[PDB]
């Protein structure tokens, strides 16, 4: 009974209210132990679907599309991704000069120290996209190396169709069918898991507002508004405009990508949201060729929401330490924050941990006593910011896929 | 050559003789390094078949029968499994009052103090039944999450069969067929492995008896006879009885379930016995809809043998510690042992580890010096006790499966 | 554009020359960070293919051929492998008495010490050949357990083809197809990756010669000649001969095993070369039933080149230490090095680590101050000796598969 998109808006509005109120009376722990378990289940059920929906769909996508098209799709979507993420930092820097976050605040030094993780070599990150055991890749996480093998196998399936033989032609047929069976099966599960969505959506914002909704006051409120307006200016001033330029109706696009966004926002897992956003692409008739490859890649590569968050936050820590950033340093963030955004995981809370890499680049390391105590205020409300981020991170990928789709 | 059921009975009788003799002359070391490995190969060979046989069969299972039907079957088998587990504890309690194991014996306090392995939250265990990577589930054991994803998968295939499409209807059929292929194959294998069964049976008891046969004398003899006749009354006073009331011939049931029951007794791994118990279920012509779900679920959930074991051993420790248990402390045993038995793994010797959980609830902890030296005497003959447990643990799943089967 | 078998030879010759030049002028680090990655990309690409190609092919192979044939092929190949490995050591010893590596040399003692790894019991290594989760076998490396289960599955698919049922016989057919689909699909992928091979080959020797080429002077040069002249005399005197005897024209055998021999040489992974060496088998038209099972087993069991290397080194150390080995100690190397060779991993540089095992049997342990400092000279030019080893390790697998196929 009842429409599904309504249930989520009701679970979202009611849950955000129920969270705040329950949380302001000090029931931060009563929500976590009682409410959260239902929001947890919603994420768990989705994660389930990620690996099969991604692997199977993309073998069929790479079998259906031309190997010259797939490669063209690739270069087009990377150029899109890179420029959207670059414009996203500058939008968060402009939002950090418009609003002033932590302008004249002096924070309690010596409270908490942090320890930055040494990032692995670029060579190793790049060579690691080619999996040495595809069964291993599936067996544990690893969407990117899966993407790679999938395409290669999909492509090989096509070459086995052109075969003179009959025994080969059929066995290649039999494989691709069954793989597509799983694919089609998965897209059916996501609907069923979307049926639980409202209950899960309710519980998740109830937890986030109950645990952190009470700390969105003071200079942490002004850093919050700087972000959410900045992200709102990313959806309108960038996506709505680039969809208008490419002749796609931007209003009915939000109609088609509603379920992805609300999941991304609440779930705060770009990775987790993948089977919803992938269905949302099939909803709007984009070829399994294109969206099977662009979405999972964009799940990790394209993070406009994160790119922006790391901008406004770099400025926050720079304002609450006294000294401002050079006009040459403002262009040194744009590069590193896009590099940090690419590198960030499609998992909850990973942006703030990756914000540490864009903090050394400007000159204020996270081992510095007072920088560390400033960072800890932001990490205090990170799950509030995380919600906006992920949603834009996800919206960005779908916007891209739609554009590449109309071009071909 | 030769009948196979006879071979296992010869391997069992000869093995337990050769083991008791060799072990009495102190050749526990020789039988461990020389004979036991042949009994291991049999165990290994069985484990092998579990993942593919469970998964592949249950996908077919959930597609084969109505999603409503599977639901009812579930509620029916859970109501079966709980009541049979609760009857099992009370039967062991009467067996621990009929006999007095550890009646007037004092033990050498301080030999070995045991240690708390903190249990995980039930909310987490329950949440853990949903697998976040179906591959990762299969990849490493994990029967329950696989049961989840399997049913879910199967159920989705059914929906693709009712599709208006042709390309969707065929590729879903193709998939169900391939997965059915695997299922069928793993049944064929378990027949093969069942030919090595006698050799592996021989070696397995030969080791259990060599290692622990001698110690089954004195008060430990009384506690052994307590358990065994208690288990015998579970089969004759509960299984034989409930099979009659439901209109299934108890003796033709025991004939068809023989291989399963023997594997279980010798293997002492309710979980390793799964592919034999699953074959046995198919041998009695039961539907893959029913037994594909019930047997793997019951392999972990329904442990009447473990429940009865924990019963008698609670009374054993209580008698060896002097003070008896109240009528309300005995009704407190019933509930905790049900939890402990369900919570107990289908792996060998695991119930003695969960016995500690049912000893905290009465008021006699495992870290208390003289309880710890009383529990060590039990752990000393646990392999002799484990054989019986596992056998009844597994018999009950088949009994329950058969009963729900006839009713449908 | 351009043939492949030409491109590889130009990459190897130009690459071995560019390597030696760059490294002699101290750029051994420059090659390692710049050139080497390309050569690693090749290895990742091949490795990708090993798990699906080995599994899918052998299930088809074992379903393709008679379980009596496969059994016979197995005993024929094991005999072949053990005999050729034994002969390889006796050839190495004859090279190391003809040449005198480390005759009049006395080394700087005490610089470096080594740590002998504790090898697990043979019974444990044998038992672990049966997997306990086939999905865990694939998931992480584990060619041998896969091999085992693959034959089993293949043989079961067959018995399912003889069933009176329609629904069983078609599902058995469907599964076999989809598995075969993948197998055919992987072989095409190797055709593609072999296109990158010359770029990979060029880089991989650039590295090896840059790092260790310059070290091949003095007494270390005399050992390198000893191993190579031996390995050559294994190719001509053992393969070219045993092939002619069995009636396969050797000259065209080398022609059709070119891609494998050169991948093995440059890549140094007997293991990672397998998808090339399995294709090369198919190219000369050997039955899948035979090479699906001989070649992957051979990758781990049959290492003529390693066995030879261990012979000529066991004679280098002993020469540097001063006191010679007995006639009965030479025959003690023959036995230990065949053993060690069988045990030695299909992975780059493993024979050297395994050389310790054969050294202890002659009475010169690796903990000994001066043995450990001579052994570090051998370990210095290892990649150099490893290239030749690996090639001859693989060639004997193809020679064995070829011979055994001709006898049927
Ligand atoms: N939850 C965010 C993580 C981040 O913003 O760093 C995402 O997956 O996009
Ligand atoms: N062998 C028993 C283990 C136990 O009951 O503790 C089983 O798996 O059923
Ligand atoms: N690279 C060699 C290692 C060895 O010589 O043991 C091989 O894979 O065969
Ligand atoms: Na994203
Ligand atoms: Na990212
Ligand atoms: Na059980
Ligand atoms: Na249990
Ligand atoms: Na080899
Ligand atoms: Na080896």
Residue numbers in the entry:
A (entry chain B), B (entry chain C), C (entry chain A): 9 to 416
Tell me what the authors wrote about this structure, in their words.
A prokaryotic cousin of the ASCTs and the EAATs, the aspartate transporter GltPh from an archaeon Pyrococcus horikoshii, was first crystallised in 2004, revealing the structure of the SLC1 transporter family. It exists as a homotrimer with each protomer containing 8 transmembrane domains (TM1-8) and 2 hairpin loops (HP1, 2).
The structure of wild-type GltPh in the presence of aspartate was solved and is similar to previously reported CAT-7 structures although the 3-4 loop, which is often disordered is now observed and there are an additional three residues in the N-terminus that are also resolved. The crystal structure of GltPh and EAAT1 in complex with substrate reveals a direct interaction between bound aspartate and R397 in TM8 (R459 in EAAT1). One of the main substrate interactions in the EAATs and GltPh is between R397 in TM8 and the side chain carboxylate group of the bound aspartate/glutamate. In the presence of an inwardly directed Na+ gradient, liposomes containing wild-type GltPh display robust L-[3H]aspartate uptake, with an EC50 of 82 ± 16 nM (n ≥ 3). In wild-type GltPh, TBOA inhibits L-[3H]aspartate transport with an IC50 of 2 ± 1 µM (n ≥ 3), whereas the neutral amino-acid derivatives GPNA, benzylserine and benzylcysteine are ineffective. In GltPh-R397C, L-serine and L-cysteine binding is associated with an apparent number of coupled Na+ ions ~ 1.5–1.8, whereas binding of L-aspartate to the wild-type GltPh appears to be coupled to ~ 2.9 Na+ ions. Thus, binding of aspartate and the expected three Na+ ions is an almost fully cooperative process in the wild-type transporter.
